[PDB]
Amino acid sequence: VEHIPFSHNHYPEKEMVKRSQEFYELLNKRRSVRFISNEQVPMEVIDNVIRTAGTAPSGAHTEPWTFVVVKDPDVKHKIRKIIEEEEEINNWIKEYLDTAPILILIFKQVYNEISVSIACGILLAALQNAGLVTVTTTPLNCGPRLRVLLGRPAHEKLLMLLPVGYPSKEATVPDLKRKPLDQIMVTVH
Amino acid sequence: VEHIPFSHNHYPEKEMVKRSQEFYELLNKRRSVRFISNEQVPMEVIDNVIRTAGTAPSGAHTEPWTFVVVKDPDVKHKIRKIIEEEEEINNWIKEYLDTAPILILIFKQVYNEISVSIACGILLAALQNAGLVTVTTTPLNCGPRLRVLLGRPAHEKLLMLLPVGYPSKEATVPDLKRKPLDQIMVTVH
Numbered sequence: 559v560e561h562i563p564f565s566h567n568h569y570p571e572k573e574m575v576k577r578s579q580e581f582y583e584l585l586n587k588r589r590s591v592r593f594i595s596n597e598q599v600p601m602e603v604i605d606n607v608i609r610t611a612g613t614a615p616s617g618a619h620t621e622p623w624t625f626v627v628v629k630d631p632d633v634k635h636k637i638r639k640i641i642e643e644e645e646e647i648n649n650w651i652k653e654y655l656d657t658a659p660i661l662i663l664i665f666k667q668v669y670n671e672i673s674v675s676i677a678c679g680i681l682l683a684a685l686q687n688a689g690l691v692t693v694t695t696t697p698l699n700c701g702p703r704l705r706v707l708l709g710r711p712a713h714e715k716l717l718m719l720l721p722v723g724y725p726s727k728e729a730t731v732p733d734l735k736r737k738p739l740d741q742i743m744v745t746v747h
Numbered sequence: 748v749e750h751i752p753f754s755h756n757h758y759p760e761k762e763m764v765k766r767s768q769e770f771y772e773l774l775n776k777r778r779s780v781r782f783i784s785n786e787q788v789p790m791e792v793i794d795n796v797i798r799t800a801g802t803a804p805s806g807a808h809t810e811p812w813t814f815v816v817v818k819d820p821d822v823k824h825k826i827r828k829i830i831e832e833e834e835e836i837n838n839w840i841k842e843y844l845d846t847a848p849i850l851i852l853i854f855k856q857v858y859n860e861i862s863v864s865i866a867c868g869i870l871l872a873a874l875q876n877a878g879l880v881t882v883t884t885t886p887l888n889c890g891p892r893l894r895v896l897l898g899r900p901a902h903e904k905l906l907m908l909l910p911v912g913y914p915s916k917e918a919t920v921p922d923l924k925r926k927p928l929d930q931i932m933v934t935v936h
Protein backbone atom coordinates (compact mmCIF):
# COMPACT_ATOMS: atom_id res chain seq x y z
CA VAL A 559 0.00 0.00 0.00
CA GLU A 560 0.94 3.67 -0.57
CA HIS A 561 3.83 5.68 0.98
CA ILE A 562 4.00 9.47 1.36
CA PRO A 563 6.74 12.06 2.09
CA PHE A 564 7.20 12.82 5.83
CA SER A 565 6.86 16.42 7.10
CA HIS A 566 10.16 17.83 8.44
CA ASN A 567 9.18 20.49 11.03
CA HIS A 568 12.76 21.32 12.13
CA TYR A 569 13.54 23.13 15.44
CA PRO A 570 17.00 24.66 15.96
CA GLU A 571 19.26 22.94 18.52
CA LYS A 572 18.61 25.46 21.35
CA GLU A 573 14.89 25.25 20.68
CA MET A 574 14.92 21.48 21.21
CA VAL A 575 16.81 21.90 24.44
CA LYS A 576 14.40 24.56 25.71
CA ARG A 577 11.43 22.46 24.58
CA SER A 578 12.67 19.17 26.01
CA GLN A 579 13.51 20.85 29.32
CA GLU A 580 10.09 22.50 29.64
CA PHE A 581 8.38 19.20 28.93
CA TYR A 582 10.45 17.45 31.56
CA GLU A 583 9.52 20.13 34.09
CA LEU A 584 5.85 19.87 33.14
CA LEU A 585 5.70 16.13 33.46
CA ASN A 586 7.91 15.98 36.54
CA LYS A 587 5.08 17.74 38.40
CA ARG A 588 2.75 14.86 37.68
CA ARG A 589 1.79 12.99 40.83
CA SER A 590 -0.74 10.27 41.53
CA VAL A 591 -3.39 12.15 43.49
CA ARG A 592 -5.81 10.13 45.57
CA PHE A 593 -8.00 13.11 46.49
CA ILE A 594 -10.18 14.36 43.68
CA SER A 595 -12.92 16.97 43.34
CA ASN A 596 -16.41 16.21 42.06
CA GLU A 597 -16.21 19.26 39.79
CA GLN A 598 -17.15 18.48 36.21
CA VAL A 599 -14.42 18.29 33.58
CA PRO A 600 -15.36 19.65 30.13
CA MET A 601 -16.05 16.72 27.80
CA GLU A 602 -14.09 18.45 25.05
CA VAL A 603 -10.99 18.19 27.20
CA ILE A 604 -11.71 14.51 27.86
CA ASP A 605 -12.21 13.94 24.14
CA ASN A 606 -8.95 15.65 23.28
CA VAL A 607 -7.06 13.70 25.86
CA ILE A 608 -8.41 10.40 24.55
CA ARG A 609 -7.73 11.42 20.95
CA THR A 610 -4.18 12.11 22.02
CA ALA A 611 -3.88 8.66 23.54
CA GLY A 612 -5.22 7.23 20.29
CA THR A 613 -2.24 8.64 18.40
CA ALA A 614 0.00 6.01 19.98
CA PRO A 615 1.96 3.41 17.96
CA SER A 616 0.62 -0.13 17.88
CA GLY A 617 2.07 -3.42 16.71
CA ALA A 618 1.01 -3.92 13.09
CA HIS A 619 -1.26 -0.84 13.34
CA THR A 620 -4.04 -2.69 15.19
CA GLU A 621 -4.84 0.26 17.52
CA PRO A 622 -6.07 -2.39 19.97
CA TRP A 623 -7.47 -0.10 22.70
CA THR A 624 -10.88 0.96 24.03
CA PHE A 625 -11.28 3.94 26.36
CA VAL A 626 -14.45 3.63 28.39
CA VAL A 627 -15.53 6.80 30.12
CA VAL A 628 -17.95 6.51 33.01
CA LYS A 629 -19.75 9.70 34.07
CA ASP A 630 -22.71 8.00 35.74
CA PRO A 631 -22.79 8.14 39.59
CA ASP A 632 -24.55 4.78 39.98
CA VAL A 633 -22.34 2.67 37.74
CA LYS A 634 -19.37 4.60 39.15
CA HIS A 635 -20.57 3.50 42.59
CA LYS A 636 -21.10 -0.10 41.48
CA ILE A 637 -17.61 0.12 39.97
CA ARG A 638 -16.42 1.44 43.35
CA LYS A 639 -18.02 -1.28 45.45
CA ILE A 640 -16.81 -3.99 43.07
CA ILE A 641 -13.27 -2.72 43.33
CA GLU A 642 -13.36 -2.40 47.12
CA GLU A 643 -14.78 -5.89 47.77
CA GLU A 644 -11.93 -7.62 45.95
CA GLU A 645 -9.32 -5.44 47.64
CA GLU A 646 -10.62 -6.49 51.05
CA ILE A 647 -8.73 -9.76 50.56
CA ASN A 648 -5.92 -10.36 53.06
CA ASN A 649 -6.41 1.52 53.44
CA TRP A 650 -8.83 -0.64 51.42
CA ILE A 651 -11.22 2.30 50.94
CA LYS A 652 -11.10 4.16 47.62
CA GLU A 653 -13.35 7.20 47.89
CA TYR A 654 -12.12 8.93 44.76
CA LEU A 655 -13.90 6.39 42.54
CA ASP A 656 -17.09 8.09 43.69
CA THR A 657 -15.91 11.67 43.96
CA ALA A 658 -14.18 11.92 40.59
CA PRO A 659 -16.55 13.26 37.92
CA ILE A 660 -15.11 10.70 35.49
CA LEU A 661 -13.68 7.18 35.44
CA ILE A 662 -11.58 6.18 32.39
CA LEU A 663 -11.28 2.40 32.02
CA ILE A 664 -8.82 1.31 29.33
CA PHE A 665 -9.43 -2.07 27.69
CA LYS A 666 -7.00 -4.11 25.59
CA GLN A 667 -8.42 -5.88 22.51
CA VAL A 668 -7.32 -9.43 21.64
CA TYR A 669 2.10 -7.05 21.24
CA ASN A 670 -1.16 -5.49 22.37
CA GLU A 671 -0.48 -5.15 26.09
CA ILE A 672 2.60 -3.04 25.43
CA SER A 673 0.76 -1.07 22.72
CA VAL A 674 -2.14 -0.26 25.05
CA SER A 675 0.15 0.69 27.95
CA ILE A 676 2.12 2.96 25.63
CA ALA A 677 -1.20 4.67 24.86
CA CYS A 678 -2.04 4.94 28.59
CA GLY A 679 1.36 6.56 29.12
CA ILE A 680 0.44 9.13 26.45
CA LEU A 681 -2.96 9.57 28.10
CA LEU A 682 -1.26 10.38 31.44
CA ALA A 683 0.98 12.92 29.74
CA ALA A 684 -2.15 14.36 28.18
CA LEU A 685 -3.90 14.64 31.56
CA GLN A 686 -0.90 16.36 33.13
CA ASN A 687 -0.57 18.83 30.23
CA ALA A 688 -4.30 19.60 30.44
CA GLY A 689 -3.98 20.18 34.22
CA LEU A 690 -6.07 17.23 35.33
CA VAL A 691 -5.07 14.64 37.86
CA THR A 692 -5.63 10.95 38.35
CA VAL A 693 -4.10 7.94 40.00
CA THR A 694 -3.08 5.02 37.81
CA THR A 695 -4.66 1.75 38.88
CA THR A 696 -4.61 -1.64 37.18
CA PRO A 697 -7.38 -3.58 38.93
CA LEU A 698 -6.87 -6.87 37.15
CA ASN A 699 -9.02 -9.78 38.41
CA CYS A 700 -11.81 -7.22 38.60
CA GLY A 701 -11.79 -7.06 34.82
CA PRO A 702 -14.41 -9.75 34.08
CA ARG A 703 -16.95 -8.17 36.46
CA LEU A 704 -16.29 -4.66 35.15
CA ARG A 705 -16.29 -5.74 31.51
CA VAL A 706 -19.65 -7.39 32.11
CA LEU A 707 -20.95 -4.42 34.10
CA LEU A 708 -20.00 -2.09 31.27
CA GLY A 709 -21.21 -4.33 28.44
CA ARG A 710 -17.89 -5.01 26.72
CA PRO A 711 -17.17 -7.72 24.06
CA ALA A 712 -15.06 -10.23 26.10
CA HIS A 713 -12.16 -10.08 23.68
CA GLU A 714 -11.50 -6.96 25.74
CA LYS A 715 -9.43 -7.35 28.89
CA LEU A 716 -9.39 -4.47 31.33
CA LEU A 717 -5.95 -2.94 31.59
CA MET A 718 -6.11 0.32 33.55
CA LEU A 719 -8.59 2.46 35.51
CA LEU A 720 -8.05 6.18 35.88
CA PRO A 721 -10.28 8.28 38.08
CA VAL A 722 -10.03 11.70 36.48
CA GLY A 723 -10.77 15.17 37.77
CA TYR A 724 -9.44 18.20 39.59
CA PRO A 725 -7.52 17.74 42.84
CA SER A 726 -9.60 18.64 45.94
CA LYS A 727 -8.34 21.36 48.31
CA GLU A 728 -7.09 18.84 50.89
CA ALA A 729 -5.22 16.78 48.31
CA THR A 730 -1.88 15.48 49.52
CA VAL A 731 0.77 13.33 47.98
CA PRO A 732 3.34 11.27 49.85
CA ASP A 733 6.81 12.76 49.85
CA LEU A 734 8.75 10.69 47.35
CA LYS A 735 11.80 11.39 45.29
CA ARG A 736 12.35 10.25 41.75
CA LYS A 737 15.59 8.54 40.86
CA PRO A 738 18.30 10.80 39.47
CA LEU A 739 19.08 10.43 35.77
CA ASP A 740 22.18 8.41 36.65
CA GLN A 741 20.17 5.60 38.19
CA ILE A 742 17.91 5.22 35.16
CA MET A 743 20.42 5.75 32.33
CA VAL A 744 23.46 3.97 30.95
CA THR A 745 25.47 5.35 28.05
CA VAL A 746 27.91 3.33 25.95
CA HIS A 747 30.06 5.89 24.13
CA VAL B 748 5.61 7.64 55.47
CA GLU B 749 5.44 11.46 55.26
CA HIS B 750 2.81 13.43 53.24
CA ILE B 751 2.90 16.91 51.65
CA PRO B 752 0.33 19.33 50.19
CA PHE B 753 -0.28 18.87 46.48
CA SER B 754 0.00 22.21 44.68
CA HIS B 755 -2.66 22.74 42.01
CA ASN B 756 -2.29 24.43 38.57
CA HIS B 757 -4.82 27.27 37.96
CA TYR B 758 -5.44 26.62 34.18
CA PRO B 759 -8.90 28.05 33.41
CA GLU B 760 -11.24 25.96 31.22
CA LYS B 761 -10.64 27.86 27.95
CA GLU B 762 -6.93 27.36 28.53
CA MET B 763 -7.38 23.63 29.16
CA VAL B 764 -9.27 23.26 25.91
CA LYS B 765 -6.65 25.07 23.85
CA ARG B 766 -3.81 23.28 25.63
CA SER B 767 -5.39 19.87 25.18
CA GLN B 768 -6.00 20.59 21.48
CA GLU B 769 -2.48 21.80 20.80
CA PHE B 770 -1.09 18.68 22.47
CA TYR B 771 -3.32 16.41 20.45
CA GLU B 772 -2.22 18.11 17.20
CA LEU B 773 1.43 17.83 18.22
CA LEU B 774 1.25 14.16 19.01
CA ASN B 775 -1.02 13.33 16.09
CA LYS B 776 1.94 14.28 13.87
CA ARG B 777 4.01 11.49 15.35
CA ARG B 778 4.76 8.71 12.90
CA SER B 779 7.09 5.78 13.19
CA VAL B 780 9.82 6.83 10.76
CA ARG B 781 11.97 4.09 9.30
CA PHE B 782 14.46 6.44 7.63
CA ILE B 783 16.83 8.20 10.00
CA SER B 784 19.73 10.59 9.48
CA ASN B 785 23.15 9.89 10.94
CA GLU B 786 23.27 13.44 12.35
CA GLN B 787 24.18 13.55 16.03
CA VAL B 788 21.52 14.52 18.55
CA PRO B 789 22.55 16.83 21.41
CA MET B 790 23.19 14.60 24.41
CA GLU B 791 21.43 17.06 26.68
CA VAL B 792 18.27 16.58 24.66
CA ILE B 793 18.56 12.82 25.01
CA ASP B 794 19.00 13.26 28.74
CA ASN B 795 15.88 15.38 28.93
CA VAL B 796 13.59 12.88 27.21
CA ILE B 797 14.92 10.06 29.37
CA ARG B 798 14.45 12.21 32.47
CA THR B 799 10.92 12.87 31.29
CA ALA B 800 10.29 9.16 30.83
CA GLY B 801 11.55 8.56 34.36
CA THR B 802 8.71 10.71 35.68
CA ALA B 803 6.29 7.90 34.95
CA PRO B 804 4.12 6.36 37.68
CA SER B 805 5.17 2.86 38.72
CA GLY B 806 3.47 0.17 40.76
CA ALA B 807 4.72 0.52 44.35
CA HIS B 808 7.07 3.35 43.26
CA THR B 809 9.67 0.78 42.12
CA GLU B 810 10.70 2.80 39.03
CA PRO B 811 11.77 -0.53 37.41
CA TRP B 812 13.25 0.75 34.18
CA THR B 813 16.67 1.12 32.61
CA PHE B 814 17.30 3.20 29.53
CA VAL B 815 20.43 2.08 27.70
CA VAL B 816 21.72 4.53 25.14
CA VAL B 817 24.05 3.15 22.52
CA LYS B 818 26.09 5.76 20.62
CA ASP B 819 28.95 3.49 19.58
CA PRO B 820 28.95 2.59 15.86
CA ASP B 821 30.54 -0.84 16.38
CA VAL B 822 28.16 -2.11 19.03
CA LYS B 823 25.19 -0.55 17.21
CA HIS B 824 26.20 -2.61 14.17
CA LYS B 825 26.62 -5.69 16.38
CA ILE B 826 23.13 -4.87 17.61
CA ARG B 827 21.91 -4.60 14.01
CA LYS B 828 23.47 -7.92 13.07
CA ILE B 829 21.84 -9.76 15.98
CA ILE B 830 18.43 -8.28 15.23
CA GLU B 831 18.50 -9.01 11.50
CA GLU B 832 19.68 -12.59 12.01
CA GLU B 833 16.67 -13.59 14.11
CA GLU B 834 13.96 -11.84 12.10
CA GLU B 835 15.28 -13.60 9.01
CA ILE B 836 13.33 -16.65 10.19
CA ASN B 837 10.39 -17.98 8.14
CA ASN B 838 11.80 -5.98 4.72
CA TRP B 839 14.44 -8.09 6.48
CA ILE B 840 16.86 -5.13 6.46
CA LYS B 841 16.71 -2.57 9.20
CA GLU B 842 19.32 -0.09 8.05
CA TYR B 843 18.22 2.60 10.41
CA LEU B 844 19.81 0.70 13.31
CA ASP B 845 23.14 1.67 11.72
CA THR B 846 22.31 5.15 10.47
CA ALA B 847 20.47 6.49 13.51
CA PRO B 848 23.03 8.33 15.67
CA ILE B 849 21.57 6.83 18.87
CA LEU B 850 19.83 3.60 19.89
CA ILE B 851 17.70 3.57 23.06
CA LEU B 852 17.12 0.18 24.66
CA ILE B 853 14.62 0.09 27.49
CA PHE B 854 14.82 -2.71 30.06
CA LYS B 855 12.26 -3.91 32.58
CA GLN B 856 13.83 -4.81 35.91
CA VAL B 857 12.07 -7.90 37.29
CA TYR B 858 3.15 -4.55 37.45
CA ASN B 859 6.56 -3.88 35.98
CA GLU B 860 5.72 -4.42 32.33
CA ILE B 861 2.83 -1.98 32.27
CA SER B 862 4.95 0.47 34.31
CA VAL B 863 7.85 0.35 31.86
CA SER B 864 5.54 0.54 28.81
CA ILE B 865 3.81 3.54 30.38
CA ALA B 866 7.24 5.20 30.64
CA CYS B 867 8.03 4.28 27.02
CA GLY B 868 4.79 6.00 26.00
CA ILE B 869 6.00 9.13 27.79
CA LEU B 870 9.40 8.75 26.13
CA LEU B 871 7.70 8.74 22.68
CA ALA B 872 5.69 11.85 23.53
CA ALA B 873 8.94 13.46 24.64
CA LEU B 874 10.74 12.54 21.41
CA GLN B 875 7.84 13.97 19.42
CA ASN B 876 7.83 17.15 21.50
CA ALA B 877 11.61 17.53 20.98
CA GLY B 878 11.25 17.04 17.20
CA LEU B 879 13.03 13.72 17.08
CA VAL B 880 11.77 10.58 15.38
CA THR B 881 11.98 6.87 15.90
CA VAL B 882 10.24 3.61 15.21
CA THR B 883 9.02 1.61 18.22
CA THR B 884 10.28 -1.97 18.15
CA THR B 885 9.98 -4.80 20.69
CA PRO B 886 12.45 -7.57 19.77
CA LEU B 887 11.94 -9.65 22.93
CA ASN B 888 13.23 -12.83 21.27
CA CYS B 889 16.83 -11.60 20.99
CA GLY B 890 16.57 -9.63 24.23
CA PRO B 891 18.79 -12.06 26.19
CA ARG B 892 21.53 -11.90 23.52
CA LEU B 893 21.38 -8.12 23.71
CA ARG B 894 21.25 -8.08 27.51
CA VAL B 895 24.42 -10.15 27.51
CA LEU B 896 25.92 -8.03 24.73
CA LEU B 897 25.14 -4.85 26.63
CA GLY B 898 26.40 -6.19 29.96
CA ARG B 899 23.18 -5.93 31.93
CA PRO B 900 22.12 -8.09 34.89
CA ALA B 901 19.93 -11.14 34.32
CA HIS B 902 16.98 -9.49 36.08
CA GLU B 903 16.64 -6.97 33.25
CA LYS B 904 14.48 -8.18 30.37
CA LEU B 905 14.57 -6.10 27.20
CA LEU B 906 11.30 -4.40 26.34
CA MET B 907 11.73 -1.89 23.55
CA LEU B 908 14.34 -0.64 21.11
CA LEU B 909 14.00 2.89 19.74
CA PRO B 910 16.44 4.04 17.08
CA VAL B 911 16.51 7.82 17.48
CA GLY B 912 17.49 10.77 15.35
CA TYR B 913 16.35 13.20 12.70
CA PRO B 914 14.39 11.89 9.72
CA SER B 915 16.17 11.51 6.33
CA LYS B 916 15.37 13.77 3.38
CA GLU B 917 13.98 10.71 1.60
CA ALA B 918 11.99 9.58 4.61
CA THR B 919 8.48 8.48 3.83
CA VAL B 920 5.77 6.95 5.94
CA PRO B 921 3.07 4.59 4.77
CA ASP B 922 -0.26 6.32 4.29
CA LEU B 923 -2.45 5.24 7.19
CA LYS B 924 -5.26 6.90 9.08
CA ARG B 925 -5.93 6.62 12.79
CA LYS B 926 -9.34 5.60 14.06
CA PRO B 927 -11.68 8.55 14.59
CA LEU B 928 -12.58 9.23 18.26
CA ASP B 929 -15.83 7.25 18.05
CA GLN B 930 -13.96 4.05 17.30
CA ILE B 931 -11.79 4.32 20.40
CA MET B 932 -14.26 5.77 22.93
CA VAL B 933 -17.43 4.72 24.70
CA THR B 934 -19.26 7.05 27.05
CA VAL B 935 -21.83 5.69 29.48
CA HIS B 936 -23.88 8.59 30.86
Ligand SMILES: Cc1cc2nc3c(=O)[nH]c(=O)nc-3n(C[C@H](O)[C@H](O)[C@H](O)COP(=O)(O)O)c2cc1C
Pocket residue numbers: 588589590591592693694695696731734802803804805806807808858861862865
Ligand atom coordinates in the same frame (compact mmCIF):
# COMPACT_ATOMS: atom_id res chain seq x y z
C1 LIG C 1 0.71 -0.35 36.92
C2 LIG C 1 0.46 0.62 38.04
C3 LIG C 1 -0.49 0.28 38.99
C4 LIG C 1 -0.77 1.15 40.06
N1 LIG C 1 -1.72 0.80 41.01
C5 LIG C 1 -1.99 1.61 42.02
C6 LIG C 1 -2.95 1.21 42.95
O1 LIG C 1 -3.59 0.18 42.92
N2 LIG C 1 -3.17 2.12 43.96
C7 LIG C 1 -2.54 3.32 44.13
O2 LIG C 1 -2.80 4.05 45.07
N3 LIG C 1 -1.59 3.65 43.19
C8 LIG C 1 -1.32 2.81 42.15
N4 LIG C 1 -0.38 3.20 41.26
C9 LIG C 1 0.31 4.50 41.43
C10 LIG C 1 1.64 4.40 42.12
O3 LIG C 1 1.46 4.12 43.49
C11 LIG C 1 2.39 5.76 41.96
O4 LIG C 1 2.52 6.05 40.60
C12 LIG C 1 3.79 5.66 42.57
O5 LIG C 1 3.68 5.46 43.95
C13 LIG C 1 4.61 6.90 42.29
O6 LIG C 1 3.87 8.06 42.68
P1 LIG C 1 3.58 9.23 41.59
O7 LIG C 1 2.78 8.61 40.43
O8 LIG C 1 2.77 10.31 42.28
O9 LIG C 1 4.91 9.83 41.08
C14 LIG C 1 -0.08 2.36 40.17
C15 LIG C 1 0.90 2.71 39.19
C16 LIG C 1 1.16 1.84 38.13
C17 LIG C 1 2.21 2.24 37.09
Ligand SMILES: Cc1cc2nc3c(=O)[nH]c(=O)nc-3n(C[C@H](O)[C@H](O)[C@H](O)COP(=O)(O)O)c2cc1C
Pocket residue numbers: 613614615616617618619669672673676777778779780781882883884885920923
Ligand atom coordinates in the same frame (compact mmCIF):
# COMPACT_ATOMS: atom_id res chain seq x y z
C1 LIG D 1 4.87 -3.16 20.41
C2 LIG D 1 5.20 -2.54 19.07
C3 LIG D 1 6.11 -3.21 18.26
C4 LIG D 1 6.45 -2.68 17.00
N1 LIG D 1 7.37 -3.35 16.19
C5 LIG D 1 7.69 -2.86 15.00
C6 LIG D 1 8.61 -3.57 14.23
O1 LIG D 1 9.16 -4.61 14.53
N2 LIG D 1 8.89 -2.99 13.01
C7 LIG D 1 8.36 -1.82 12.53
O2 LIG D 1 8.68 -1.39 11.43
N3 LIG D 1 7.46 -1.17 13.34
C8 LIG D 1 7.13 -1.69 14.55
N4 LIG D 1 6.24 -0.99 15.30
C9 LIG D 1 5.66 0.27 14.78
C10 LIG D 1 4.27 0.11 14.21
O3 LIG D 1 4.33 -0.60 12.99
C11 LIG D 1 3.64 1.52 13.97
O4 LIG D 1 3.61 2.23 15.18
C12 LIG D 1 2.21 1.37 13.46
O5 LIG D 1 2.23 0.79 12.18
C13 LIG D 1 1.48 2.69 13.42
O6 LIG D 1 2.21 3.63 12.63
P1 LIG D 1 2.69 5.04 13.29
O7 LIG D 1 3.58 4.71 14.49
O8 LIG D 1 3.47 5.80 12.24
O9 LIG D 1 1.46 5.87 13.73
C14 LIG D 1 5.87 -1.48 16.57
C15 LIG D 1 4.94 -0.81 17.41
C16 LIG D 1 4.61 -1.34 18.65
C17 LIG D 1 3.61 -0.58 19.53
